[PDB]
Design a protein around this ligand. Structure first.
Ligand SMILES: [Mg+2]
Length: 555
């Protein structure tokens, strides 16, 4: 059984983790200083978002040199000391791998853009104007507008699925692939334990580059004709030579493809993230619009991914949070009265699923969205732009602010709140982004000194995954599918079950075990609960607001 199957991963966004230098920006030395904290949480993998040399046009996802570290974050010596101090504590480290595109400041692009005959020209994707003066395709960039950028000096457009200074690498080019693999070897040989592969399912483009009527063009590069081939090749050349863990981040993918990506027979990736459960509060798929989450759809989404991947032999990365997503307690939980209870409930809801769980820095503290009530507190360029545009269109100030409070991509980027000192102890300087005033009540020092804290609830969930094999091997069975408040399910094992019951809302409601649930001869014991008010009988009882209970049933 691979070491990653029962692992729990702690996601670190270094800019906002811990500043040890006083410049207001988190750094690698800060992570080192926190390894004992991460071990205390009982995570055994650390995942760092991009720390590579980069102009920082796109939050580090525009990489100008894969072999060195952004100076702000520290030195390569720091990094190697982090690998060494981590491994000594039994913690593995995986890196973020961004190889769909490079910065246009990368050596290869500067060379390639110089002319149609430069050696590196075909490292990127170039096409001519259409006769009608239109771009090569009508495909849209995910940052909006055309996915093609004209390069005057050479007379062609290069492709960018993402931002303008993020030029898509040409994966049809075997030369490019080999260079990527060499780069991957460099890091593995340095001693990292794996990679999360950023938007990896878009590297295979339809080489006929046709126009998209019915859409924005994503139909022509998402889970494309050669993605499985490329990943498997990457497996043979790189992943197969190390004791590694690889997780792919998928854009707009499908269950069928994710089964192929992660079934061990494919020799592609170990697991994948998909984001469908994090779109359950998008009205009509509009990412910036306000709405309450659709609970039944959420349950349906989680259950499909559980049962289908289980049947297909695939593996899910399990998570609620990212540097790009709202903090989960504010989003699907209650960040007021029931902040602690609902944070624990959400943690249990997803950790008791089949797969490998990911904790985003500060989630274990129940950090909330910061509720910044003024435009000067925000940093994310997309938020600043959105405020500018909505202001120009005459939306009132308070209404724009409400939108940013729910949707700004800064929301989970505020500094980790360590203690109740200045700037929550994140920095002795001025943080690059403000700390909200809740820090005095919400911080690690306070959580670590409260036996009933969210932090220790996560610790227990993390250790349970090591202690109870059914969390890894049990199937998944949804019950109470139509219930408007309860998310409940079973994990069925060999004369052993888990029954997990989560109230997703702040009202009392009844749980009754369905008649088809055959538990004859099983004894029940509480595995973990966020409430000491335990039912006389789990078979029928009144669930308290945001109550979360897991029963361990055995013969
Ligand atoms: Mg610093």
């Amino acid at each position: 059984n691979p070491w990653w199957k029962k692992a729990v991963v702690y996601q670190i966004y270094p800019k906002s983790f811990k500043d040890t230098t006083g410049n207001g920006v988190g750094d690698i030395r800060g992570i080192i200083e926190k390894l004992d904290y991460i071990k205390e949480l009982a995570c055994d993998v650390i995942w760092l978002t991009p720390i590579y040399q980069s102009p920082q046009n796109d939050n580090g996802y525009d990489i100008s040199d894969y072999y060195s570290i952004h100076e702000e974050y520290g030195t390569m010596a720091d990094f190697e000391e982090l690998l060494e101090e981590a491994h000594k504590r039994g913690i593995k480290v995986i890196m973020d791998l961004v190889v769909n595109h490079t910065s246009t400041e990368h050596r290869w692009f500067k060379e390639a853009a110089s002319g149609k005959e430069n050696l590196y020209r075909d490292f990127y994707i170039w096409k001519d104007m259409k006769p009608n003066g239109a771009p090569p395709t009508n495909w849209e960039s995910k940052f909006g507008g055309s996915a093609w950028e004209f390069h005057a000096e050479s007379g062609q457009y290069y492709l960018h699925l993402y931002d303008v200074t993020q030029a898509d690498l040409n994966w049809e080019n075997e030369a490019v692939r080999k260079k990527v693999y060499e780069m991957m070897h460099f890091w593995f040989e340095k001693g990292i334990d794996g990679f999360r592969l950023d938007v990896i399912n878009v590297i295979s483009k339809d080489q006929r580059f046709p126009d998209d009527d019915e859409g924005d063009g994503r139909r022509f590069y998402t889970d494309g004709p050669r993605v499985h081939e490329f990943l498997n090749e990457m497996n043979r050349e790189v992943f197969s030579k190390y004791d590694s863990m690889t997780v792919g981040e998928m854009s707009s993918t499908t269950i069928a493809d994710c089964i192929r990506y992660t079934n061990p027979e494919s020799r592609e990736l170990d697991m994948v993230f998909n984001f469908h459960h994090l779109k359950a509060d998008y009205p009509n798929g509009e990412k910036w619009a306000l709405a309450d989450f659709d609970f039944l759809k959420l349950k349906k989404i989680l259950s499909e991914w559980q049962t289908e991947m289980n049947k297909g032999g695939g593996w899910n990365a399990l998570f609620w949070c990212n540097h790009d997503q709202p903090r989960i307690v504010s989003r699907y939980g209650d960040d007021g009265k029931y902040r602690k209870k609902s944070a624990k409930m959400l943690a249990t809801a997803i950790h008791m699923l089949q797969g490998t769980p990911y904790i985003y820095q500060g989630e274990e503290l129940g950090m909330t969205n910061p509720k910044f009530d003024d435009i000067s507190l925000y940093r994310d360029v997309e938020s600043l732009n959105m405020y500018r545009i909505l202001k120009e269109a005459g939306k009132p100030e308070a209404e724009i602010i409400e939108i940013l409070k729910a949707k700004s991509r800064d929301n989970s980027r505020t500094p980790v709140q360590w203690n109740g000192e200045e700037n929550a102890g994140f920095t002795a300087g001025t943080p690059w982004i403000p700390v909200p005033d809740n820090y005095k009540e919400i911080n690690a020092e306070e959580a670590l000194n409260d036996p009933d804290s969210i932090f220790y609830h996560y610790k227990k969930l993390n250790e349970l995954r090591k202690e109870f094999d059914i969390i890894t091997t049990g199937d998944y069975q949804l019950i109470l599918e139509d219930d408007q408040e309860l998310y409940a399910y079973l994990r069925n094992g060999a004369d052993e079950k888990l029954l997990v019951i989560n109230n997703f809302y702040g009202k009392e409601t009844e749980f009754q075990l369905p008649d088809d649930i055959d538990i004859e001869g099983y004894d029940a014991k509480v595995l973990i609960s966020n409430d000491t008010d335990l039912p006389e009988s789990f078979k029928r009882f009144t669930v308290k607001p945001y109550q979360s209970i897991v029963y361990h049933l055995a013969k």
